[PDB]
Amino acid sequence: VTRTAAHTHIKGLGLDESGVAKRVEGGFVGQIEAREACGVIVDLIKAKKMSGRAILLAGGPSTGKTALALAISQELGPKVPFCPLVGSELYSVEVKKTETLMENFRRAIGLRIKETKEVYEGEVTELTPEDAENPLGGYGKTISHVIVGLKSAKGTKTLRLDPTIYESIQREKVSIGDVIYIEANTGAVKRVGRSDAYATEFDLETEEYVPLPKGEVHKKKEIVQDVTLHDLDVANARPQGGQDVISMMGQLLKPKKTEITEKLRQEVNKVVAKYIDQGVAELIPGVLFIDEVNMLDIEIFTYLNKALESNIAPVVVLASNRGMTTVRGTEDVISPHGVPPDLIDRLLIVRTLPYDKDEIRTIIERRATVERLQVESSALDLLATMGTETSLRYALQLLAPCGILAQTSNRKEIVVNDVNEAKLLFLDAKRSTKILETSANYL
């Protein structure tokens, strides 16, 4: 029916109205203090008043660090922007890692804008261009104006254009009897399609036929747009959508990230502030989640020390699973979690404890009832023994071969013999390492 991939049994933190975490809610088992801290920073983000506040999820493997990040992402909803990231993302071959970090910082600051649009739409009735006196005079255009007759429901207008809007209009290859959509904000036009007032069954151009647009030709409509600040920086860095030379030429060069200057960010922030102060725009800060923060080298941490002190900084969530590991890019600096102490002083470390055997068993129960599999209680106890003996993830990823070996024997339930056969077929890390030690030629 659906598709599940190591997740989607988590719907949220599952807290009460007072912030106290229930034991089994939202697909979570245990981690009561971690879920309470995640709820506290959920209320901090929903307060929408703080900038440059960061937490660090510390713990072993298979303890629920990334699951907590998906939980806060689901608890905030899709309205607040969430930017998942990995420590290996920032090493780009087209721009420096500082610029990639700043772009991902600006990609977590959303913006809601109620934008008005001037729209001229209707069915094209006439199309008559007037020529110039000297078309080969070097300067000037070939034509002077273009008369367009637009007719919609209960309205009919005659439009006299410049050459410039007509270049974009004839770029779409419109004709007589096609309904168009002249957006007067950017000058961009859209060929809506053929009209069904004329014939339909005599075309070879796989066309679509739309009726006459309701209302008058000239319109002013309100559109609610949800953009980020990084999209504004990108759109001003590589400008497209105007009716000039560079706006054409920007859509045909190969896309490439550039080092966005700080002056452009100031100008974007100034016009965003004047949008908010007019009552038009609304600022929605979000979360930048960086999984495996220990993969970063020392220079990105050094720039993070400044970027967490900026005034439009988002809330950053880091996850690490190192005890006492030297930071990459250095030789002698030994630091907790692979995170240097000058940024660790700015963090708020949240500890994530491991699980007990009963927690393993009920996590296996939840993953069996999410993956649409029915298991016996003896096989459930055997898989709890797997989780407490080898790994939690090894017991998690052995449900589906057990189900398939049950289905190939024409059965729905899973028995202990199925788990024994799945033991015989598939190995774990410990048994593979054990067969790697007593090996003939590097097995």
Binding site: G19, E36, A37, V40, D43, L44, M50, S51, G52, R53, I55, A58, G59, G60, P61, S62, V93, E94, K96, T98, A237, T258, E259, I260, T261, K263, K270, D277, Q278, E299, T302, Y303, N305, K306, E309, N311, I312, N321, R322, G323, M324, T325, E331, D332, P336, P341, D342, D345, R346, L348, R351, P354, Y355, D356, T388, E389, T390, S391, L392, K430
Partner: protein, 436 residues
């Protein structure tokens, strides 16, 4: 204007100083560090005089002891019209610009050129626009009546200005500003006639406005260079500007200064965590400071006897001794209980959080015992736990709950040292399973 939610340095209005450069115990959001504040005031006065150039001053001390706060206060007391570049140590390791090119751009971003120019403008409220045209539109005659609160007039317009008025459509009751020389008509909105909104302009219609323009030398370098346009200021694709244009803009700036058409405005370039630049960057720095068109470089670092990048030895503050010879060093000190208490009270006032006195004393005690920034983060964390219980004043129990939930450096490294077997060490060894 200048949007910001809450910054870590948002409480620093400026350097707290008197008329005799004497630091107050508490003023403008800065408490403590009296000698460092006096030294930064001396730095600020030397920038304000502007008679010298290319003097590097280094700020060093323990971490989380007023280092970046001093530069924030310096930039705040500098005010507008003076440039203040704030780059980090990792900001210059680019892929399209060399390290010396990035340092030269950062140097030339911090010196201003101040030009005052005068332009006539027409700004008023449009009463009525009458435009008559022929059948083919060969000639267009137009009469535009326009008014202020003090006077009104009727203007006869030629065909180009008619073409500039039907473009960017101006109706009755709108207020516009007309640049007569360039034809730039900007609609400021609508006036108070409903039956945006902005008041009708007063005084004379033709106002002679003198606008004081400031610009950086790096801005004129890309403009005078013909390989790239002005968009390289915005897309950041200047791409290794040559030096032959730099001598031209330097000589033209000297000629403008001699002729009185422009005046120089020296500024401050601030580099925080300067201990991460290479030795090549320092070798560019120590000769870039001996030029007349150079700013006052503020350097910040917290290392002590560390390895210099690109070498094998260790140097004091991560910098070689020639650059330390060219620098004057401001040393910052640590904080006592009273200074930490006043800093936390300032952060509580700035974050709109009401605190109990006993909760403030507990926060001060745990700030002394662990860290200033840990208390400065818990002071905003605990307000949400207080609002979960639905009361305004944060009590001791909320701070205790926030201290229990969110760990600090020492408790976390103690838990890590207790459970080293469950984490991944330097050899990549880990034990995930509970039993055996």
């Amino acid at each position: 204007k200048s949007l910001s939610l809450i910054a870590a340095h948002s409480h620093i209005t400026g350097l707290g100083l008197d008329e005799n450069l004497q630091p107050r115990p508490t003023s403008e959001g800065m408490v403590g560090q009296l000698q460092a504040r006096r030294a930064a005031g001396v730095i600020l006065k030397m920038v304000q005089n502007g008679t010298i150039a290319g003097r590097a001053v280094l700020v060093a001390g323990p971490p989380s002891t007023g280092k970046t706060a001093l530069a924030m206060g310096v930039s705040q007391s500098l005010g507008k019209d003076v440039p203040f570049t704030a780059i980090a140590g990792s900001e210059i390791f680019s892929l399209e610009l060399s390290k010396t090119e990035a340092l030269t751009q950062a140097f030339r971003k911090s010196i201003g050129i101040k030009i005052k120019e005068e332009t006539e403008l027409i700004e008023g409220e449009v009463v009525e626009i009458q435009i008559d045209r022929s059948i083919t539109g060969g000639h267009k005659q137009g009469k535009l009546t326009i008014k202020t609160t003090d006077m009104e007039t009727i203007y006869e317009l030629g065909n180009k200005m008619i073409d500039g008025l039907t473009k960017e459509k101006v109706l009755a009751g709108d207020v516009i500003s007309i640049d007569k020389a360039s034809g730039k008509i900007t609609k400021l909105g609508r006036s108070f006639a409903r039956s945006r909104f902005v008041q009708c302009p007063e005084g004379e219609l033709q106002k002679r406005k003198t606008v004081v323009h400031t610009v950086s030398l790096h801005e004129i370098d890309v403009i005078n260079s013909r390989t790239q346009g002005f968009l390289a200021l915005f897309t950041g694709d200047t791409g290794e500007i040559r030096s032959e244009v730099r001598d031209q803009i330097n000589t033209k700036v000297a000629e403008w200064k001699e002729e009185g058409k422009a005046e120089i405005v020296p500024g401050v370039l601030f580099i925080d965590e300067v201990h991460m630049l290479d030795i090549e960057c320092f070798s560019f720095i120590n000769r870039a400071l001996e030029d007349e068109f150079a700013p006052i470089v503020m350097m910040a670092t917290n290392r002590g006897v560390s390895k210099t990048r690109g070498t094998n030895y260790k140097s004091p503050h991560g910098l070689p001794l020639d650059l330390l010879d060219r620098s004057i060093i401001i040393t910052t000190k640590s904080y006592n209980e009273q200074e930490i208490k006043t800093i936390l009270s300032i952060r509580a006032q700035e974050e709109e959080v009401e605190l109990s006195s006993d909760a403030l004393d507990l926060l001060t005690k745990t700030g002394v015992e662990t860290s200033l920034r840990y208390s400065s983060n818990l002071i905003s964390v605990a307000q949400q736990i207080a609002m979960k219980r639905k009361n305004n004043t944060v009590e001791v129990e909320d701070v205790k709950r926030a201290y229990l939930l969110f760990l600090d450096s020492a408790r976390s490294v103690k838990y890590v040292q207790e459970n080293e077997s469950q984490y991944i060490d330097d050899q990549g060894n880990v034990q995930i399973s509970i039993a055996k």
